[PDB]
Design a protein around this ligand. Structure first.
Ligand SMILES: CCC1=C(C)/C(=C/C2=NC(=C\c3[nH]c(/C=C4\NC(=O)[C@H](C)[C@H]4CC)c(C)c3CCC(=O)O)/C(CCC(=O)O)=C2C)NC1=O
Ligand SMILES: CCC1=C(C)/C(=C/C2=NC(=C\c3[nH]c(/C=C4\NC(=O)[C@H](C)[C@H]4CC)c(C)c3CCC(=O)O)/C(CCC(=O)O)=C2C)NC1=O
Ligand SMILES: CCC1=C(C)/C(=C/C2=NC(=C\c3[nH]c(/C=C4\NC(=O)[C@H](C)[C@H]4CC)c(C)c3CCC(=O)O)/C(CCC(=O)O)=C2C)NC1=O
Ligand SMILES: CCC1=C(C)/C(=C/C2=NC(=C\c3[nH]c(/C=C4\NC(=O)[C@H](C)[C@H]4CC)c(C)c3CCC(=O)O)/C(CCC(=O)O)=C2C)NC1=O
Ligand SMILES: CCC1=C(C)/C(=C/C2=NC(=C\c3[nH]c(/C=C4\NC(=O)[C@H](C)[C@H]4CC)c(C)c3CCC(=O)O)/C(CCC(=O)O)=C2C)NC1=O
Ligand SMILES: CCC1=C(C)/C(=C/C2=NC(=C\c3[nH]c(/C=C4\NC(=O)[C@H](C)[C@H]4CC)c(C)c3CCC(=O)O)/C(CCC(=O)O)=C2C)NC1=O
Ligand SMILES: CCC1=C(C)/C(=C/C2=NC(=C\c3[nH]c(/C=C4\NC(=O)[C@H](C)[C@H]4CC)c(C)c3CCC(=O)O)/C(CCC(=O)O)=C2C)NC1=O
Ligand SMILES: CCC1=C(C)/C(=C/C2=NC(=C\c3[nH]c(/C=C4\NC(=O)[C@H](C)[C@H]4CC)c(C)c3CCC(=O)O)/C(CCC(=O)O)=C2C)NC1=O
Ligand SMILES: CCC1=C(C)/C(=C/C2=NC(=C\c3[nH]c(/C=C4\NC(=O)[C@H](C)[C@H]4CC)c(C)c3CCC(=O)O)/C(CCC(=O)O)=C2C)NC1=O
Ligand SMILES: CCC1=C(C)/C(=C/C2=NC(=C\c3[nH]c(/C=C4\NC(=O)[C@H](C)[C@H]4CC)c(C)c3CCC(=O)O)/C(CCC(=O)O)=C2C)NC1=O
Lengths: 286, 49, 161, 48, 172, 160, 162, 160, 162, 172
């Protein structure tokens, strides 16, 4: 008892209680820590765009030249005899901006032979949007405006129309190398631009010059004219037509039974709110 | 092969001989001498005879 | 029934052989794992009720099984089902101590498949109840004993399917 | 019995008609629960 | 892009005809109710943040799995993406409501959206629900605002609902 | 039912039903029309009885809807009222038959073992049933309320 | 299950006879042929995924209307059951390649085919067109006797469906 | 004891003790002095052990010692520790006997019915026993602590 | 996920280049540094429980009003979600310690932080004060280069929130 | 991008947990063997050109059809492409070897590669073989280098092999 009197009364006086705050346990079931970026975009999530700044030694200039060549020509090998040594020398001398170096590369006969002479006009427009603007076409009307400008003003004026666009200046300025952007949602961007950018961007190992049965065909134009589709994922990532089985948890059944349970559900919530269970008097014990 | 795969190809000789009596003759085997005569013919002359 | 040790004795008795080197090696392979079997049994026994509750929670209840039309609907049948679960757990603990599955055949599996067919007891659902108890058991008993406990739960479940 | 001795598996065996009532009774007779409580404390003559 | 007038015009043209007196007066009525429409669009704009916030609080109240590891609204990056999508959809619903036509919503937002989410592993049923909650609160605001002239906005509340319901249906 | 109970005892002495174990059946038949009516009345107000039972319960025992309580939370409370809906249903069955019979097989034999596993406090389930008696009984005439009350007190008794 | 081995054994058994030089010569054919067969099998096996998606799509491209609402190429379940079915065919083709005969095709797809397709309103034309497409693409995965083998069995399915 | 258990099985099969039965009596009796030391240590610290069990218990279940709790109050708590003192005593008996015969007849057979009547939450009594294991075990060498621990886990087992 | 290893590899890849002595020297830094990092990690790991309860409370002691009714430090759910959140931060600090870079912090807490906190009416000040407190106590759990590492990452979070 | 630590972290996070003492010591061991790892990566970098060259000489020694007209390593343009691909793959294998994880190899190099080659008409079995030859020579160098301290590098030689074997399997 006495062990009770001494080590036990004040202790109960609320000290015993304080309360019961703490935890949390778990914790969503399944996996996926910041992966999705696994669909070949891990490097790209947001690719880090290379800015070249003044009083630059060289190593930075050599890195910007490599980045600009990787962006404009993809993963395609370029011979040392095929490099535009004059444009690289003008960039090394700070005599041209990164924007104007890209203009000289895009107007070059090498870019004309690989992307213009070997490809359909619509696929050439799809690729210019990829290389110069880092994005897919938003509407079939955008492909039509570039095609009409090409037909009226010729090749060099189509290239200038991408580089003198307010969109190019707003996003890359004069000193940033273009980088792939279609993996982000921008304000005013179509949701279909992500799927189309992914169809155009076959991952880092992708060659835009591939003569094998799809690479010269319009990957995006088939879809654009209308309501019909998505982009080929080369398809071992778009889950190869998973047919959307339907992630629905065992709770599915509770929903069904309680729908009767749901009449009691409201009553649950409804009396919970009028009520708080902090009250613990409970007994009467008359 | 319709008859051969079903009633011959996966059974023993007793089941096959008694199935011949049910299918072709429509009756059951009468004694052991009917079975010991037919299988001797099977081993001597094959399934076609 | 038989255990590791009597499995060997009876295999030699029918040949009338004294135990030889191969026999003696087998028996050693049992004795050398013996202390670990005991510790594992004491964990299972003392957590029996919690293992059933966590196994039922992951694999049986909150489902059509416990709803009208389901085989574990009614307090009667819910009680019969977790009663069964306790049998499985308890006997698997015997098999694992003995280091021999023979008791699971003699006193648990014999006729059980057809008994369940005759009452309507869902076999696939019962297997999940077995493999959920295994999952819990393997956490509680630790590295030492996990694989050895596990096999007799797997013996039970391929005995029904 | 306050959920005592009883018959785990014994009840399912008797119901199911796997075992018959005579048999179940015989099992019940030779068991620990029985030996203790009726033969644990008696000379050889009243237990019979 | 279409609005309710432009839609009329496209259907008329496909007949090779000047607008029918039928269609004319349907459009005269839209002009008749346009002050109410402006208040309805204004109701959403003026409470956009709270509409998204309140929808959000409630979505995660219901679906506490999304904010556990792995869950699709965990860690901060994913929650920000989810909050951003709630805003994007509320935005195109308000555009449709100013326009009197769903097309901007269907063409710029809903087209391809389901297949995006499935590719991403984003649970579409949860996204549908977040849209249902935005609807409840948005309409709440359309119906009970600051010193607007008293009248009947049920026609507009319905139409707003169908835009919320289009989005939900399209996504689930 | 009353029928099942009478008959089962009859076959047990290899005998015919006697003049007593007929009178009860006759009483039950007259009672059954009234009994059927009471069950229908109870069925009509089921949602109100359950909900008001659930409020009466959580005032009297707030501990079950508290941190370490079996019914703590919105969906641990939803299942709790569903169980209260189950038992009201069984009570209507018991009343109509005239004998408790089926309710026992459906919801008391095995109930200790079920709830012990789930760790549900049995005596507070008995309280939830008293709470339903109080509500249901206020929707019935004095005579019918008593007749119903016996079946409520049985369930309260069996969870014990 | 029909293979060169089972066929010669069946023919021996039915005459109550040991296998003789006639029957063993036959078996050598089946064994000599295994290399080409099994190369076809490995190529069809690893390309299965895309061969199936290619043929499924081609059924919709050749029968555009199938993909409209109210039709049998619409909704996840039809399109799912289609991929599955072509996958069944390619699977049994590989089995027939590996087995040394049409047995797997005869027992698991041909026996009963028309009755099933007729009850379920499945047109053979789709399946022929799935297979014609698979035959087009298998032209560049294989060559020589592996291609001839692949062809033999694809064509066997197309004749079963006509 | 080990003796009682061996003999009862012997007499019930009308026979002398087995080699096995004789062996265990021998191994058991060899551990006599050790078992007596284990009981002494724990007897010597009894007042400390119950208390530390009692603190461990009320942290883990502050509710038992709360308005609607079986052990709520100074004298409802005094009886609770007294019950913890009872079970520690029985554990010392079991250790010196080498089995549970005594522990069982004195304090587990009938314990469900006793505590159900008093409405004592059985599983929190099992916790009080785990708490005593933890304290007692910290006053014993590794080998003796394990030997003691089996008897604590038995009681924990029987209240189940 | 940003670590010394991933950074040098990224820089090589982007110039189409094998790893050279520059990049391997860098990697050696990360490996040489692992011991101090991982000691900090183990200490933060086992003290997690109390570091979290200490910081949670300190948020209420520094912002007393939070714990009054109608406020965001009131009721079980707010106070629960708070402990959890500080626990998330300590968790990613240990990850950043073990990983050899800020990656885990950048990817799981920094990316999106402000948008989330702004929508949910969560003041960074609380979180800074949680972290300032955690920094005070970690002064006596560690010393030398393990403390410097712990500090580096705690401070990194505080700057992310200012 | 993942390395061996980052991988640990992702798996821990999916549990909602601080790294297990299990995982901690696995990573302590990686730090333990890291000097050897640096030598192994250095072995490849320091002989990259010869590894590619020697693999190449031997590939065309075996498969003289590739260097005939009609062959996929003819004319100079195609041979340069083939030599370039040999370098690219050797490069991502060395990255994986510094990282202690295959992901950079699988994500930036192997993903889609087979389907590229098939589209191009590039014989994948020949490419697989060129990778097998690079493996032989690369490991040769990992095992027998300039004045490195003597010890056991077999664990690392295995791991390097699996990266070569991943690539081969993925491509063939
Ligand atoms: C329109 C056609 C065209 C011309 C003519 C041209 C000249 C030119 N020469 C340059 C550099 C250069 N030019 C030279 C040339 C020489 N060094 C000597 O000592 C000799 C006297 C002389 C060779 C005979 C050198 C060394 C540099 C590099 C200067 C430096 O970066 O330090 C640069 C700077 C950009 C660069 O380095 O690539 C330009 C633009 N660029 C053009 O696009
Ligand atoms: C055409 C107009 C348009 C729509 C509608 C659109 C939806 C859309 N939502 C996305 C992601 C997302 N959407 C959400 C949304 C939610 N998360 C939840 O838990 C809630 C249930 C719900 C908010 C109510 C989240 C969390 C992500 C990121 C998923 C991830 O990366 O893990 C993505 C992937 C690209 C990205 O993350 O930016 C698209 C394309 N994109 C568009 O261009
Ligand atoms: C992500 C890193 C990456 C990889 C791995 C890559 C592979 C790749 N190899 C290609 C071509 C090629 N690859 C080869 C390779 C070979 N030919 C043979 O006969 C041999 C079996 C083999 C050398 C071992 C050849 C010959 C071509 C040119 C095919 C042609 O144009 O006809 C192409 C087409 C673009 C181009 O020719 O530049 C790509 C994208 N591209 C990348 O960006
Ligand atoms: C499916 C292939 C097949 C087999 C295997 C077969 C066995 C077989 N053996 C039989 C008889 C027989 N089998 C034997 C064999 C033996 N007697 C001995 O003492 C020896 C131990 C043994 C020889 C090694 C004898 C003696 C009979 C005649 C029994 C009798 O009629 O009394 C019979 C009864 C029909 C008949 O006599 O023809 C069958 C069906 N029949 C078949 O169709
Ligand atoms: C018709 C015969 C019958 C009954 C009665 C029955 C009850 C029953 N109650 C359950 C749960 C439950 N039942 C309750 C009930 C309560 N919680 C409390 O604290 C109160 C004392 C009480 C409400 C008055 C709770 C809280 C759960 C959830 C327990 C858990 O999930 O662990 C479950 C498991 C969930 C499920 O799968 O349905 C069953 C089967 N099943 C039956 O077949
Ligand atoms: C000592 C070895 C031994 C075992 C294992 C055993 C099993 C066993 N399970 C039985 C019934 C049953 N068993 C279950 C089991 C289940 N219900 C479900 O839905 C679940 C899938 C599953 C639990 C996981 C149920 C519900 C019944 C009652 C069937 C009835 O209503 O008659 C019966 C019929 C007799 C009885 O009801 O007790 C036996 C004998 N008997 C034995 O002697
Ligand atoms: C800056 C852009 C702009 C806005 C927003 C605008 C609003 C606007 N709302 C008006 C009326 C109104 N607005 C409402 C709206 C409502 N009534 C309700 O009870 C609902 C809560 C709510 C439903 C949306 C009603 C009922 C009227 C009076 C009837 C009418 O004029 O149609 C009027 C007519 C003058 C008046 O009666 O106050 C104007 C000018 N005008 C503008 O130029
Ligand atoms: C072992 C070998 C095997 C084969 C070959 C097979 C075919 C087969 N296809 C079926 C159904 C089906 N088959 C299809 C086929 C298609 N739908 C489309 O989008 C395309 C037009 C087309 C693919 C070219 C469809 C839509 C159904 C569902 C028919 C129904 O139940 O209404 C069914 C009916 C059972 C079921 O619904 O699954 C069988 C048995 N089953 C087998 O076991
Ligand atoms: C993976 C890394 C990660 C972080 C850091 C994170 C923060 C975070 N804190 C949240 C809520 C919260 N955060 C708190 C924080 C506090 N409350 C208090 O008592 C204190 C003042 C304070 C702690 C210092 C509160 C009260 C909420 C609930 C806000 C609400 O829904 O109203 C939510 C909204 C979703 C939810 O309700 O859980 C996120 C995403 N989430 C993450 O996934
Ligand atoms: C510039 C980047 C960099 C490199 C490359 C580096 C290498 C390096 N390798 C070392 C050891 C070593 N390196 C090896 C490697 C090998 N042993 C063999 O027999 C194999 C042929 C080869 C297999 C790869 C061995 C066995 C040791 C000694 C054991 C050890 O320190 O782990 C040591 C410890 C000092 C020593 O014992 O020499 C360093 C610093 N350190 C660096 O900072």
């Amino acid at each position: 008892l006495s062990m009770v009197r001494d080590i036990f009364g004040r202790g109960y006086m609320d000290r015993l209680s304080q309360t019961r705050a703490i935890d949390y346990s778990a914790d969503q079931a399944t996996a996926d820590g910041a992966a999705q970026t696994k669909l070949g975009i891990t490097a790209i999530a947001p690719d880090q765009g290379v800015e070249l700044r003044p009083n630059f030694t060289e190593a930075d200039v050599i890195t910007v030249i490599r980045a600009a060549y990787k962006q404009l020509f993809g993963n395609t090998y370029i011979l040392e005899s095929e490099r535009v040594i004059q444009a690289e020398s003008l960039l090394r001398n700070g005599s041209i901006s990164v924007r104007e170096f890209i203009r000289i590369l895009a107007k070059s006969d090498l870019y004309k032979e690989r992307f213009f002479r070997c490809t359909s006009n619509n696929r050439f427009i799809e690729l210019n949007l990829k290389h110069l603007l880092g994005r897919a076409p938003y509407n079939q009307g955008e492909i039509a405006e570039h095609l009409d400008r090409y037909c009226q003003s010729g090749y060099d004026a189509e290239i200038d129309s991408y580089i003198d666009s307010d969109e190019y200046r707003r996003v890359f300025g004069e000193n940033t190398v273009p980088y792939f952007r279609g993996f982000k949602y921008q304000v005013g961007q179509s949701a279909a631009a992500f799927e189309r950018m992914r169809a155009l961007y076959s991952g880092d190992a992708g060659s835009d010059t591939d003569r094998n049965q799809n690479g010269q065909r319009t990957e995006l134009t088939s879809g654009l004219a209308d309501p019909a589709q998505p982009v080929r994922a080369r398809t071992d990532y778009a889950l190869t037509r998973v047919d959307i089985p339907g992630g629905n948890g065992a709770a599915g059944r509770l929903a069904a039974l309680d729908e009767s349970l749901g009449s009691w559900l409201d009553a649950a919530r409804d009396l919970i709110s009028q009520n708080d269970y902090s009250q613990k008097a409970i007994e009467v014990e008359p | 092969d319709l008859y051969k795969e079903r009633f011959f190809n996966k059974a023993s000789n007793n089941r096959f001989i008694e199935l011949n009596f049910k299918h072709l003759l429509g009756r059951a085997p009468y004694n052991h001498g009917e079975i010991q005569e037919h299988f001797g013919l099977y081993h001597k002359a094959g399934y076609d005879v | 029934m038989q255990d590791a040790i009597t499995a060997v004795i009876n295999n030699y008795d029918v040949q009338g052989k004294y135990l030889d080197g191969a026999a003696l090696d087998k028996l050693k392979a049992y004795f050398t794992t013996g202390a670990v079997r005991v510790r594992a049994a004491a964990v299972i026994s003392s957590n029996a009720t919690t293992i059933i509750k966590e196994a039922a929670a992951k694999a049986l209840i909150y489902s059509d099984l416990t709803r009208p039309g389901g085989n574990m609907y009614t307090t009667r049948r819910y009680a019969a089902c977790i009663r069964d679960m306790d049998y499985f757990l308890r006997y698997a603990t015997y098999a694992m101590l003995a280091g021999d599955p023979s008791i699971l055949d003699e006193r648990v599996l014999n006729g059980l498949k057809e008994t369940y067919n005759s009452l309507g007891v869902p076999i696939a659902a019962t297997v999940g109840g077995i493999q959920a108890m295994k999952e819990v058991v393997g956490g509680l008993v630790g590295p030492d004993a996990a694989k050895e406990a596990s096999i007799y739960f797997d013996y039970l479940s391929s005995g029904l399917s | 019995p306050p959920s005592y001795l009883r018959l785990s598996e014994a009840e399912s065996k008797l119901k199911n008609n796997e075992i018959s009532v005579r048999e179940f009774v015989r099992r019940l007779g030779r068991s620990e629960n029985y030996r203790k409580r009726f033969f644990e404390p008696y000379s050889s003559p009243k237990v019979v | 892009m279409q609005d309710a007038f432009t839609k009329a015009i496209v259907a008329a043209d496909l007949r090779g005809s000047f607008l029918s007196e039928q269609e004319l007066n349907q459009l005269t009525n839209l002009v008749k109710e346009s002050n109410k429409r402006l208040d309805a669009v204004n109701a959403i704009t003026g409470n956009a943040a709270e509409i998204i916030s309140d929808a959000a609080h409630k979505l995660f109240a219901e679906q506490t799995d999304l904010i556990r590891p792995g869950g699709n609204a965990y860690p901060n990056r994913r929650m920000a993406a989810c909050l951003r999508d709630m805003e994007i959809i509320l935005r195109y619903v308000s555009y449709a409501l100013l326009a009197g036509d769903a097309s901007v919503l269907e063409d710029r937002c809903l087209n391809g959206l389901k297949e995006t989410y499935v590719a991403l592993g984003t649970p579409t049923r949860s996204v549908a629900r977040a849209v249902q909650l935005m609807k409840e609160t948005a309409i709440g605001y359309v119906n009970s605002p600051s010193g607007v002239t008293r009248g009947d906005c049920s026609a507009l509340v319905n139409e707003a609902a169908t835009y919320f319901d289009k989005a939900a249906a399209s996504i689930a | 039912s009353v029928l099942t109970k009478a008959i089962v005892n009859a076959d047990a002495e290899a005998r015919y039903l006697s003049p007593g174990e007929l009178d009860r059946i006759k009483s039950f038949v007259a009672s059954g029309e009234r009994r059927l009516r009471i069950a229908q009345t109870l069925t009509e107000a089921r949602e109100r009885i359950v909900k008001q039972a659930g409020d009466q319960l959580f005032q009297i025992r707030p501990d079950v809807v508290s941190p370490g309580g079996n019914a703590y939370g919105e969906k641990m409370t939803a299942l709790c009222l569903r169980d209260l809906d189950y038992y009201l249903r069984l009570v209507t069955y018991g009343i109509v038959a005239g004998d408790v019979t089926p309710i026992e097989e459906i919801g008391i034999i095995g109930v200790k073992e079920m709830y012990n596993s789930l760790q549900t406090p049995i005596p507070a389930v008995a309280e939830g049933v008293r709470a339903m008696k109080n509500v249901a009984t206020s929707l019935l005439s004095g005579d019918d309320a008593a007749e119903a009350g016996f079946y409520f007190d049985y369930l309260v008794g069996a969870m014990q | 299950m029909k293979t060169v081995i089972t066929e010669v054994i069946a023919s021996a058994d039915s005459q109550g006879r040991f296998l003789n030089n006639t029957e063993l010569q036959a078996a050598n054919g089946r064994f000599q042929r295994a290399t080409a067969s099994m190369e076809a099998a490995r190529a069809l096996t690893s390309n299965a995924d895309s061969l199936v998606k290619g043929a499924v799509q081609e059924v919709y491209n050749k029968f555009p209307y199938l993909t409209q609402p109210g039709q049998m190429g619409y909704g996840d379940t039809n399109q799912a059951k289609c991929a599955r079915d072509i996958s069944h065919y390619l699977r049994f083709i590989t089995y027939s390649l590996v087995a040394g005969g049409t047995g797997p095709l005869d027992d698991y797809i041909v026996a009963g085919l028309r009755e099933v397709n007729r009850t379920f309103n499945l047109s053979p034309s789709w399946y022929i067109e799935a297979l014609k497409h698979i035959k087009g693409k298998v032209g560049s995965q294989l060559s020589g006797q592996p291609l001839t083998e692949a062809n033999a069995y694809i064509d066997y399915c197309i004749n079963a469906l006509s």
